[PDB]
Design a protein around this ligand. Structure first.
Ligand SMILES: *[C@@H]1O[C@H](CO)[C@@H](O[C@@H]2O[C@H](CO)[C@@H](O)[C@H](O)[C@H]2NC(C)=O)[C@H](O)[C@H]1NC(C)=O
Lengths: 105, 448, 117, 448, 448, 117, 105, 117, 105
């Protein structure tokens, strides 16, 4: 299978600050990477797909980029509602896999 | 050699004379055709598709390798000697092909030294240099499809969609491959397999295959349509899924004393109806012998008839006499169709059944008439320099035969029916008449 | 609108099987695939397996010997099954729809059903 | 006109009656087919591929232009007059086609005024307006392929890979083009070339070609399958590599006094074996004449038989008498195959050989039996309203012929063998018997 | 049963013995083929193309649905009863197929419960689960093309260019679809439609269709080439543009008492010319009966002949006597072609016409000669262990027939001409001789 | 070089038709499409309709019942027609060439002709 | 048809300043968006096509980006010659349409 | 691993030919192309020519009349030849592998061989 | 053939500074542009291909962009090891060509 490493494990940032999450793949997954925002008690929300495109309904403060093995998610103005566990997923080969996730306070 | 004047009088107008040519003395080149595509740069998006493909393909190629092994395992250097006992049963074509197969193996063994280059090939066409002096080409099935539609589509379509497209491309390939390399290929030994069939292993792209091999251009296109360019499967590799094919490139040679004469059928008048003579349209003449030919298997061009073998066949004595002037023996079928040739042009001379086709003379303003004692009218310089048939106005030349062509007349032969059902009926009704005659003579013999 | 709703057992003993049914609406199962993902108490999200639009399936390596997925195109349902459970299979199991022609991005998720072992 | 009651008794059950229709009086439109793709927007990734393509293609088209020039250079305004001397040899079809070619040139000359628009065309299909009243369409080979798979792939695949894909697309195109526009096209003048063949110049996409030309919809699909829609090559441009084709759209007309009757073959009992009568399955009747037809070249539908020419052929007097009731002259072949039709349904009446097929009556619970003096049994309303053959239960109507159909009986004709080898054998063995009779009578004449 | 020793003496060398096998007792599966692609994710770039497509396609499918309705509307549960009166006219094949169609409807009604899943399908291949126990597959035409070449090309090519590519893909699809599901399909009821034809509805990709259905592998490939695997159109949906096809998968069974013997034709000497015997190459023997077969419609493999029906045909008494040793009745055709088999190998024994082919003995250095009283020479262990024909050296075994094979000789039958024109000529010339004999005997009867 | 030049009437009465001819050079009409756009006195640019490289046409919805486009491939001309004018059709009418195979981006424009109604 | 909204209606900026114009589509038009600079008395000039590529001859101070429904045009150094009415056009489905336009002083 | 190693003559006279052989390993010549580039003493990198995966070749215009490239698929070698040398042909000659299906980016280079004329 | 111009001919920058190299093509070469780092005594190293993607093993401080005729290479933190001659190459049409190169101290 294809493993993924996501870091930092935990983040602390204030409202209005720029927040970034880094994720790297053990293999080449081209542009096949998705980002999710997961709050406890709720199902995960899709934020970004194909390493850059926002899911419909996702605020434009979210953006991202990446290719092959190095990818990132950025928030250009952190909101109180952005607290939660962020997940990095590749959807290139099979199986699809998720990283450990980043907990943002 | 044919009595063209008497023949034109019964609806058989001299047509185009063509040379008789047959393929011989071929040059050979070996080409490698890999039936399995290289998917190394989309290896994460193949699933189990290639595994299923290899299994299915092995089931197609294994019976071919086996058929070739029967001859290969039983052929040895003497000068090539075959184990006739071990072969058991074979035709002459298989036997001579078995030797060609054996001799060809000696170069296949050189090609196989590049097995790793053949497997590594990722382009649809690769030129491999064995020793500079020796060059072999490798053609890969579906490689162009993959290089343009699956590999560059990695972030255009999903990985699973890419896998499905590969599976379908492979399945479609096999669907067509099976019409040539499937169960129908009971004999992969005989070197009679047309190159347009072999090329199905490369998508049916025989033009690429042939250009790749260079060939000779004296009459290349005639060789292809006549199926003179053929190949033989020399080697099958069931681990790498490729075959080695020897492609034969014969030279069409002219037969110094042979030609084929085309006759042009024209409906003619007899009694009060239209008739058409049933005589071979293409007559083969070799030296002083008039014979038939299965020209339906040959290519016909403006100057020659190109055959991939000798198709000459026997002719009866009655038909030969018909052709040399004994027209009382030329069979005729009734014309009932409204659509029959009613005229023909030959060397500027117009022959027409002016009873069934309206004939008028352009230069005189008078109609051209035909009596019931005439079959076709010959119209030329002497009667009407420019004649009109229907809505076509034709400027004519001169007839070089008898000036009394339209006055002398001709003998007419017996009626026939060419329909398959009519043939069975005619044979049967003749047997009833024959048995009656047999009984009548037996009664006479008993009385006497 | 689009919905996915998981329904299944709560407490299931070790060595027993698990069967969770995902009832869906708003889309056809002949047009979209359905993926199963779980969330163990102190772990990240784990992709379990998929049944594709085409009805074929794939599984991750860890559960390949235990995990099976099936479908019903008459009742609009997708079925997640584990042949034999362990106590570390305690997790919230989710049904998610993929994006069009097998593309990733789980825009649509169900509610999640908690399985205790 | 056919004696259907006596015919059904010998295994020839009246089937479907269909109208006889033939294509006539066509409308014409000219279309331009460009065989060379426009690669202007990938001009850096063609290499020498287009140069090799143009040369190879010229070698295909030049012989066509030449064949057309022979007629064009020898046809002049009078009212069209042809130089019969210069043409030398031609068939009636070529001659009338030569005029059509000449007349067609007059519009080709208008189309050619758009030569630069034809060359500039970069879409697979372009509608060009000559004068608003006059419209000509241009179809371009492989243009869609290039516009979707090579041009938009500029930074998807390498430039050399793009070149290789172009070369293969062009080579595959020619590989198929050659089956129609290659050496086999010895006569591009005759307007008998089916549109499905011409369309190979546009990838075989004849549906696009025809929709492009609008056409008439009265019976369009029947015209296509019967090969009534054809074209003629009018002009060949060897510098621009395009041709102008005139497409003929005939109207199928009904022949007021002609129909084709299908008979349904049913195996019947005679002596202690199964027999099948060898009589034409499709019989053509025109006015009061019963004749044959080469229906194998026609389209058969539920209401009519659609032919692209008149295929009527002669019938023997013995077969005509067979068909009108003299069944003692109807030939029969032995049935040895386990798979033969053993029954047929006609107008609700069931005809079955209840010796070889198990017949039971659904309404009575009794079996239906047949004696050795009977051929087929006629089963209807009067004997068994619902009859069972094998596992099929059929509700029947009433027979409108003789109520004594199953009692009267019928005369049976002689045995035949229809196999090609058997035909040669039968003719030969009859000649041995014939020569014996000839010797016997000659001896009697010498004695007397 | 055949007198192989006398037959080899006249150029008919015993060849390969094969088993006679015929398809029977099929298993059935239903598959859904959707002829209209799903363009939902490019809905802004279709224009009016899909509207024109639906109309054109309806004009292809409607006549099929109608033909099926004729049987469906007239078939009811009794145990299936058909309204023979309403059907009016039908063949046995149609009648039994009409029942199969009716019974098949009962499952088509289950498949149709997934109509919305069939319409929603956007993959080329979708497996739909009806009740887990029941599974139906849906195949969609051009879906793979669209998913890989139009949908992912949204910002690669313009929207209008995408529309044009869709229109051409649809038109090309119909161009090929029409050869199978067009006007030629006068009878969609009979279950005799080969699966390779049905698959045209899915691009001709029959390999995908069949793999999708699983099938049985005992002799799958032989079943396909022999056209034993066929389908029937059960249901046509003109609102959704899909059809339900029942695919039949028969098992080839061996006939315990039947085999086909191949003879290998060899030119032989007679008088001062080459002759070839005209005897069936493939002879069917069942129990004690020698008969013919239309093997041209069967698949020939190394061990068996695979037929999709019984093709056995009658043989004349004269040919049967020829085959059992009365060689004075075996017909022969003159060989005039330079290319004829002049030798054959059978069970290690070499038979050759050493007058026309140069024969030399490898072990003695001496030539092998043939007298004018001999037809072929039999060469084996006793005369020459290793013999050479032309450039091929063959190691031979032993002949198990008469040791005097080359000394005893054989009777030779009469000359024949097999050419179609020659057949008509021979029948006619025999009638002239027959009428002369008839007149001569009638004169004798009047005198006596 | 590439040029497009519009020529037509100035003042045209209401209920009369409008006919504007675009004469072009530097390119073939068999290679490129031609689009018509107008600029009303106080409005933005309005796309009216197109005649494609293939000779086929499309129109916006507002003018679909009044607007027609035609071509002449012998004289290198494109024709814009409105069957019946309103006073709000006063605008500058422009002829523009599209980019290659039906791509947008009007790199080349004509001069513009002012029509008063 | 497909509508487009372009804003602000009117802009005021000095020479050398960064100027941006925002445009959104009522539907998904992928990368099919063009930008024009239109001066009065002249025909419109193409600046940007396919939401990012400059037309040949257009100064490199112009750039842009966007996808699906949200697009923008940017000038990295406003010149005196950049005055005029800017237009947003989509060229995805048919008909092609323009927004109201932005007047930049 | 992947390697390319050039071997050839050092000092070669004007009007003599040059023959440099590139021995390769780690990849097949049937899968990848090989390009030749040189570095003259005071100039930039100059691309000379290529032998493609398919075995066909291309050359720049300056050396088209003098430069030839060949291959040996049995010994894993690529051959660079110049028919007649000039003193300005003094340069370090390099053998480089291209990227997959004829894509640029010379990720892999040999060592370079210095030729003096 | 297709010519390329690369500039400045020579650069001087300190460690940690941002360094850029500009290259323009005489014709349209789409995204077909590669960048190399060449030290004397060694073979050239590939840095960037298809005008933006890093070669495997190349430090992420390197990046680039460009299209058609205008391209550039950027170093976001110059290191001592980045000294050398940089080369611009197009690989679109045939022949492939290199520019004069930039010498960075
Ligand atoms: C009789 O027919 C011959 C042709 O067979 C005509 O002769 C040709 O006349 C043309 C006149 O333009 C010459 O160019 C040809 O060279 C002539 N050919 C030959 C073989 O001589 C002749 O003119 C005809 N005569 C009449 C009275 O019609």
């Amino acid at each position: 299978d294809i493993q993924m490493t996501q870091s930092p494990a935990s983040l602390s940032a204030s409202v209005g600050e720029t927040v970034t999450i880094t994720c790297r793949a053990s293999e080449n997954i081209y542009s096949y990477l998705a980002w999710y925002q997961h709050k406890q008690g709720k199902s995960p929300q899709l934020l970004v797909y194909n390493a850059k495109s926002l899911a419909e309904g996702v605020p434009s403060r979210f953006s991202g980029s990446g290719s092959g093995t190095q990818f990132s998610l950025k928030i250009n103005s952190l909101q109180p509602e952005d607290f939660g566990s962020y997940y990095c997923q590749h959807h290139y080969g099979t199986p699809w896999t998720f990283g450990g996730g980043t907990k943002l306070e | 050699i044919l009595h063209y004047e008497k023949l034109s009088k019964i609806g058989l107008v001299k047509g185009v004379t063509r040379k008789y040519k047959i393929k011989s003395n071929p040059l050979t080149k070996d080409i490698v055709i890999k039936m399995i595509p290289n998917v190394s740069n989309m290896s994460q998006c193949t699933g189990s598709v290639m595994e299923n493909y290899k299994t299915r393909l092995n089931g197609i190629l294994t019976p071919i390798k086996g058929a070739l092994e029967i001859y290969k395992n039983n052929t040895h250097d003497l000068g090539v000697i075959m184990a006739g006992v071990a072969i058991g049963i074979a035709t002459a074509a298989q036997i001579t092909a078995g030797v060609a197969l054996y001799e060809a193996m000696k170069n296949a063994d050189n090609i196989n030294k590049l097995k790793s280059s053949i497997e590594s090939t990722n382009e649809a066409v690769v030129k491999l240099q064995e020793t500079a002096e020796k060059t072999v080409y490798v053609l890969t099935a579906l490689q162009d499809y993959i290089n343009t539609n699956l590999v560059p589509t990695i972030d255009k379509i999903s990985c699973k969609q890419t896998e499905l497209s590969l599976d379908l491309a492979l399945s479609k390939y096999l669907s067509d491959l099976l019409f040539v390399f499937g169960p129908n290929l009971q004999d992969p030994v005989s070197n009679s397999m047309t190159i347009q069939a072999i090329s199905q292993a490369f998508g049916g792209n025989y033009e690429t295959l042939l250009r790749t091999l260079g060939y000779a251009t004296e009459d290349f296109d005639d060789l292809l349509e006549s199926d003179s360019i053929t190949g033989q499967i020399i080697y099958v590799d069931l681990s790498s899924y490729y075959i080695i094919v020897r492609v034969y490139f014969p030279i069409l040679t002219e037969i110094q004393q042979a030609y084929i004469q085309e006759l042009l059928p024209v409906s003619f008048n007899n009694d009060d109806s239209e008739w058409i003579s049933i005589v071979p349209n293409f007559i083969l003449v070799r030296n002083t012998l008039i014979s038939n030919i299965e020209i339906g298997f040959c290519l016909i061009t403006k100057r020659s008839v190109i055959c991939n073998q000798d198709y000459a066949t026997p002719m009866t004595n009655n038909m030969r006499e018909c052709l040399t002037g004994s027209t009382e023996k030329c069979p005729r079928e009734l014309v009932v169709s409204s659509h029959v040739p009613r005229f023909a042009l030959s060397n500027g001379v117009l022959f027409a059944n002016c009873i069934s086709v309206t004939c008028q003379c352009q230069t005189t303003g008078r109609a051209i008439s035909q009596s019931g004692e005439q079959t076709l009218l010959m119209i030329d310089n002497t009667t009407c320099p420019t004649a009109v048939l229907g809505n076509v106005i034709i400027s004519l030349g001169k007839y070089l035969g008898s000036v009394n062509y339209n006055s002398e007349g001709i003998a007419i032969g017996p009626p026939v029916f060419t329909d398959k059902v009519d043939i069975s009926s005619q044979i049967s009704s003749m047997n009833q008449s024959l048995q009656q005659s047999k009984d009548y003579i037996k009664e006479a013999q008993r009385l006497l | 609108q689009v919905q996915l709703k998981e329904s299944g057992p709560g407490l299931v003993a070790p060595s027993q099987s698990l069967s969770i049914t995902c009832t869906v609406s708003g889309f056809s199962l002949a047009s979209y695939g359905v993926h199963w993902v779980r969330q163990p108490p102190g772990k990240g999200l784990e992709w379990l397996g998929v049944i594709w639009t085409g009805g074929s399936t794939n599984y991750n390596s860890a559960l390949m010997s235990r995990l099976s997925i099936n479908r019903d195109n008459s009742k609009s349902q997708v079925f997640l099954k584990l042949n034999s459970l362990q106590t570390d299979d305690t997790a919230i199991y989710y049904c998610a729809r993929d994006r069009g022609y097998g593309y990733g991005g789980f825009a649509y998720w169900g509610q999640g059903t908690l399985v205790t072992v």
